[PDB]
Structures are given as C-alpha cells and as structure tokens.
Amino acid sequence: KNIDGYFKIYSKHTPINLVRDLPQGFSALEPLVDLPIGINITRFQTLL
C-alpha cells in the first residue's frame, strides 16, 4: 500500500495441502519493508 509517499510491504509464509484454493483457516502478515519513495502508483505488474 501507499500512504503519505511511504510504500509499505507486509508478508507471511505457510505450508498448504489443498492445491485448488487459498486456505480456509486464519493467519496474519507481519511487516517486512517500508520505502519513503514519494511516487504516484495506479498500475502494477508481477515478474516471473
């Protein structure tokens, strides 16, 4: 997310045993990175 020119990144990792869908159970994402970049964002694209 973007707030006041900060770009904020949160993350989590877990094992999974259903291939089809995201897990029905609950887990929460701790912060990892926070960048003071001051940039307009309206599009994104992943990289493989």
Partner: peptide, 24 residues
Amino acid sequence: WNSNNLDSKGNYNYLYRKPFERDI
C-alpha cells in the same frame, strides 16, 4: 536562508512547475 552570494548572478536555471510527491 538567503543564498544571494551563491545562487544569484541573473541566474535563470532554478525551475518551478499529495504530500511528499515528486512531480517530475
């Protein structure tokens, strides 16, 4: 502070066009 001894000549290079956003 006034930088009148450093940045004056005149000097025409110094340019003007949400918080902390750089509109380049």
